[PDB]
Amino acid sequence: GYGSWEIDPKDLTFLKELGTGQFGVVKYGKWRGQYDVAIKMIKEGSMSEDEFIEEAKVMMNLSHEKLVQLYGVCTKQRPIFIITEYMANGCLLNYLREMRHRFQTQQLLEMCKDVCEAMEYLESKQFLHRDLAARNCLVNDQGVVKVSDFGLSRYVLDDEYTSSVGSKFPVRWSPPEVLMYSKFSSKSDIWAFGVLMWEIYSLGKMPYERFTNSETAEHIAQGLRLYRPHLASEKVYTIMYSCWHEKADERPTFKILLSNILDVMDEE
Numbered sequence: 001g002y003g004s005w006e007i008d009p010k011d012l013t014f015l016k017e018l019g020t021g022q023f024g025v026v027k028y029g030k031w032r033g034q035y036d037v038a039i040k041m042i043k044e045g046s047m048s049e050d051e052f053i054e055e056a057k058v059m060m061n062l063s064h065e066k067l068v069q070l071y072g073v074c075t076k077q078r079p080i081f082i083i084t085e086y087m088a089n090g091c092l093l094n095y096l097r098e099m100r101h102r103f104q105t106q107q108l109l110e111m112c113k114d115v116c117e118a119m120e121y122l123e124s125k126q127f128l129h130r131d132l133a134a135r136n137c138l139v140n141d142q143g144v145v146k147v148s149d150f151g152l153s154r155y156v157l158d159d160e161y162t163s164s165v166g167s168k169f170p171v172r173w174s175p176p177e178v179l180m181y182s183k184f185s186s187k188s189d190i191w192a193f194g195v196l197m198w199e200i201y202s203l204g205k206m207p208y209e210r211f212t213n214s215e216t217a218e219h220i221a222q223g224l225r226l227y228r229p230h231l232a233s234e235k236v237y238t239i240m241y242s243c244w245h246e247k248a249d250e251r252p253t254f255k256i257l258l259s260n261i262l263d264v265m266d267e268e
């Protein structure tokens with residue numbers, strides 16, 4: 001079985017429906033009567049057994065404070081449950097678009113820092129995310145941003161690349177070598193991170209806000225990039241822009257990006 005990862009359904013309680021997507025309903029509940037959890041009730045026939053086993057392995061091997069944590073699964077009942085850590089402020093993209101937060105740039109840089117820490121860990125484990133974007137990060141009650149949409153959490157979040165069976169490609173988060181040749185690498189994650197920084201500093205604007213995906217691909221083919229968001233200092237823009245070098249091998253690592261971000265944070 002799944003050992004300690006197999007959660008006893010008797011230890012779950014339900015409080016509120018958070019969402020309903022392609023792979024089923026997500027509810028906010030408690031585990032053991034004390035721990036806040038997001039509970040995904042998997043729609044029967046939305047994923048195969050092998051897919052589940054593969055994606056479970058992914059989440060069970062990876063663990064970091066800035067990665068949305070799997071708590072467990074219930075697999076002896078129908079429907080299947082996936083139990084994850086609860087993130088009270090939900091999706092980062094919607095969070096950024098709420099104008100009432102009136103974010104300081106210090107807050108925005110800390111969001112970047114949180115994600116960069118998670119990505120550095122993934123980098124260290126040789127794990128490629130492949131769909132890093134604000135829509136795929138979650139925010140907890142404390143304003144801490146964490147990366148999700150990996151392994152089983154792809155199904156929890158009703159990932160549109162997964163639910164569209166590859167139809168909806170993240171063009172606006174992709175480097176030229178991906179758009180041209182499907183050449184995925186750590187450096188395609190690095191590129192995505194830069195675009196994410198841009199999303200954060202643009203308070204959740206769609207990247208290439210006046211372009212189609214097709215115009216976007218042409219724009220980057222001309223060596224052109226996203227402008228500096230007004231809220232981003234020149235130093236911050238230098239960091240995000242470094243992620244978009246034409247040559248993949250000229251792009252920084254997440255280790256370097258984290259050091260750059262911290263240096264700017266301490267400089268304020």
Ligand SMILES: Cc1cc(Nc2nn(C(C)C)c(=O)c3cc(N4CCN(C)CC4)ccc23)n[nH]1
Binds near residue numbers: 068084085089090156
């Ligand atoms: C996996 C996981 C998901 C999760 N929490 C939430 N997930 N989702 C979907 C991604 C399922 C929401 O849509 C959502 C929305 C909110 N509202 C949104 C409205 N805002 C004003 C208050 C917070 C909170 C939490 C969530 N924690 N862990």
